[PDB]
Symmetry: C3
Subunit: 222 residues, 3 copies
């Protein structure tokens, strides 16, 4: 079942990528870079999840299964999602690349701490986990503070679309660390099959759903 | 023999890099970035191949030359960047198209590494994903990228077409040799594959940049 | 003792990062990018050294301890320090990103050769070490040659600050390969505890000290 679910994920990711490629042919004022980012995210995620389906993207550490291919996915897909969010705030204005790369740096660190926490035992696990949550909070502060102020400087219609996408992404993103802590990597209150289903469903809303909402809004401003 | 060949490769790479550095001192209207790219490719490839000569860049009942993937994950995207900048010479840069090629190429090299560590059908799933990536790269090279080269004039377009055909020919040889050699069907022997992955890279890591830079320098007059 | 020293390092790195964040709030004509770089260097170094304190960032290779977390640190922190130096030379003028990325490329290669030398045995160790020293010499040539000429083109006051920070960084940087060769990774003349102290103290002068000197100088040019 675990294998079949991952094949299904990969096929959905492929269809998402094709959809964004079709939209790119009639761009409606959205620069090509934002279509390219929307295509890379699901293609990369699809390839990582395919490695899990084929039994390669996981190993047995102590008496637990580490799905290490999820970290390979997120270290590329999550910074690209933050870049898409930042470019949405900056649509029709000057780019602030310093703020964009600040988000990328926080995000890569967050994903690495999660990988190290998964390989850790005892208190050390929760030190790494905690550093990642701090990174996520600073990301949320930037998202609803300075980045939202840039979106307001680009006008009411853009600011409203930005706010909608920021809330959408922020809602997903708090679920990941929560699921991690409850599942076998953390306190073990939730079963492996439950965690697998969450980390199949959530990524569909994050790696394809976010880009549908984000690009449709920007296209409607044309 | 395998060790000596790799030392020889590294020394050739060093001479190629020195040559490009000398050309950079009299640039003839070619931006410094294009000389830098031409220097990094052989120096990185040389260092990877040196690790094979010294017995470090491989592990073992099949021998995986993993240092080749370390080489290509840096050297192949830089070759596509040099090709893309050749098309765009004298005109507006399209960095979205350039980064699309880098992304496809890095993916292609990673699939090859995973295919080499894989057994049975799984090997050929990964191999196949890499071939699809390579086909999209060739479509971009002869389609949209060639259209940008045409928009920059007949002389540039002719040089672009020549270097594109040159690189496109090398590049189909790599996956073909991989499949026939010990990583794939095993029809060809280890020593044969070693010689192919010594000779081909000399044409790709030094030869391509001689052809590419000489053409661009000739457009100065 | 080795663990406690690494915890102390990490806490100092955190305080350095907070200091640079505070300076950023009143930037005095220094672009945001230079404050961001000054913050990333100690935060990254802190996290790497924390992994050593917790017993994760090292392993036993035969009869030696490899502190591999140091290379994870330097592969990010050292190119960012060269970027800060290059941006100091280019302050008030056109950026030369080709020269900046030439320094990044040399530096990443230098750190990789060090990691491979540490995993190597016998003559092979000293081949890799040597390639890294050649990279470091080319970096020093660029620093005192073309990069210093760019600093001169941006005025006497900038050029004087550039020269001061370049000498500061150049002194630190020759110490790293010297300590490496004398310690357990090389000739083994110095003991593990000695090398650990050097690779706690030097990084404090490089990962926080450099950025205090560099940013204070640039902020003084606003007045
Ligand atoms: C934790 C790993 C860190 C890796 C990422 C490093 C990020 C630091 C780089 C900073 C680049 C700054 C962006 C360039 C500024 C251009 C001007 C602007 O639009 O603000
Ligand atoms: C698949 C492995 C990892 C690859 C990651 C590559 C990232 C691709 C995203 C880059 C965005 C491109 C930005 C171009 C900006 C300028 C736009 C233009 O003028 O065309
Ligand atoms: C050893 C691994 C090396 C990896 C990094 C190599 C980088 C090579 C690429 C060169 C990019 C140069 C940027 C050119 C921008 C032109 C504008 C300018 O010069 O100011
Ligand atoms: C995205 C593409 C990369 C995905 C990463 C997966 C790495 C897979 C490595 C597999 C090692 C062999 C496992 C086995 O056959 O037992
Ligand atoms: C280790 C892995 C690191 C992966 C990071 C992926 C790259 C991140 C962000 C690049 C996005 C920058 C986009 C700039 C667009 C500029 C524009 O279109 O105006
Ligand atoms: C979740 C926390 C959101 C806090 C938003 C802060 C807005 C003001 C600011 O810090 O600039
Ligand atoms: C929405 C809530 C979903 C989670 C509830 C089911 C948990 C199952 C389990 O703990 O194994
Ligand atoms: C620099 C270019 C990259 C070279 C990297 C590959 C070699 C690194 C591995 C060294 C291990 C030596 C010990 C052994 O395997 O016998
Ligand atoms: C086998 C090689 C396959 C591909 C060759 C190139 C495909 C056609 C070129 C691009 C066509 C175009 O878009 O104009
Ligand atoms: C040019 C083509 C070279 C073909 C060499 C075939 C012999 C290799 C072998 O089967 O061992
Ligand atoms: C951010 C910091 C990155 C550096 C961290 C490296 C830690 C690697 C952890 C490897 C698992 C250690 C196994 C163990 O606990 O014995
Ligand atoms: C390994 C990577 C090494 C490459 C760096 C080559 C140094 C070139 C110096 C000259 C830079 C320039 O072209 O302006
Ligand atoms: C070019 C400059 C490189 C300078 C570096 C010197 C390393 C020399 C090798 C170390 C001494 C030999 C030790 C031994 O063989 O046991
Ligand atoms: C994977 C999604 C499809 C991408 C195909 C691109 C081919 C190049 C088209 C140029 C017009
Ligand atoms: C025993 C397990 C304890 C879990 C600790 C998790 C705390 C939440 C993250 C850290 C937030 C920092 C404030
Ligand atoms: C008006 C200033 C911004 C307030 C943001 C409130 C916090 C949002 C948290 C979202 C998480 C879901
Ligand atoms: C002891 C258990 C403490 C649990 C704390 C609540 C859940 C922590 C994770 C929250 C992740 C999102 C933070 C914004
Ligand atoms: C046994 C460990 C202590 C209980 C921790 C449970 C945390 C539940 C958090 C729920 C938030 C959605
Ligand atoms: C004969 C051996 C030549 C070694 C040259 C050095 C390695 C290539 C450049 C790095
Ligand atoms: C081994 C890495 C170094 C090899 C250098 C190749 C030749 C380039 C010389 C560049 C000197 C620049 C001085 C301004
Ligand atoms: C297994 C040791 C390999 C060290 C070299 C790593 C270089 C990675 C470049 C991407
Ligand atoms: C592991 C991935 C490493 C990829 C190498 C980086 C290639 C990027 C080169 C782009 C140069 C563009 C120059 C613009 C003018
Ligand atoms: C690893 C996934 C890489 C995905 C790159 C997708 C390439 C799409 C084609 C480029 C744009 C064509 C313009 C017409
Ligand atoms: C790995 C550590 C990365 C640290 C990034 C620091 C980001 C802080 C941004 C400050 C706010 C800018 C406005
Ligand atoms: C394999 C590890 C690669 C580490 C590279 C770290 C990033 C180095 C370059 C960042 C600095 C760019 C500064 C541009 C300034 C423009 C203003
Ligand atoms: C054993 C460790 C050796 C490290 C040597 C570090 C370099 C020493 C100084 C030589 C380079 C001088 C560069 C001056 C550039 C003038 C322009
Ligand atoms: C035990 C011996 C400790 C030696 C410390 C050397 C550190 C040099 C720092 C220079 C500032």
């Amino acid at each position: 079942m675990i294998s079949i679910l991952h094949y299904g994920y990969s096929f959905i990711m492929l269809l998402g990528a094709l959809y964004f490629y079709l939209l790119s042919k009639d761009p409606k004022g959205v620069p090509a870079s934002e279509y390219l980012i929307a295509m890379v995210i699901p293609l990369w995620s699809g390839a990582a999840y395919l490695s899990i389906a084929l039994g390669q993207g996981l190993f047995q550490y102590d008496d637990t299964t580490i799905y290490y291919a999820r970290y390979i996915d997120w270290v590329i897909s999550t910074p690209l999602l933050l870049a898409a969010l930042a470019l949405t705030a900056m649509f029709g204005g000057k780019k602030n690349l310093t703020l964009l790369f600040s988000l990328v740096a926080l995000d890569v660190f967050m994903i690495i701490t999660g990988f190290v926490a998964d390989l850790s035992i005892g208190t050390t696990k929760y030190i790494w986990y905690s550093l990642g949550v701090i990174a996520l909070i600073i990301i949320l502060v930037i998202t609803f503070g300075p980045l939202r102020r840039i979106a307001l400087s680009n006008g009411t219609r853009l600011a409203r679309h930005y706010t909608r996408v920021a809330i959408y992404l922020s809602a997903l993103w708090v679920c990941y660390p929560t699921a991690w802590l409850l599942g076998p990597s953390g306190l073990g209150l939730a079963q492996e099959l439950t965690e697998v289903l969450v980390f199949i469903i959530l990524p569909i809303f994050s790696k394809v759903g976010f880009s549908i909402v984000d690009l449709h809004g920007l296209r409607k401003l044309h």
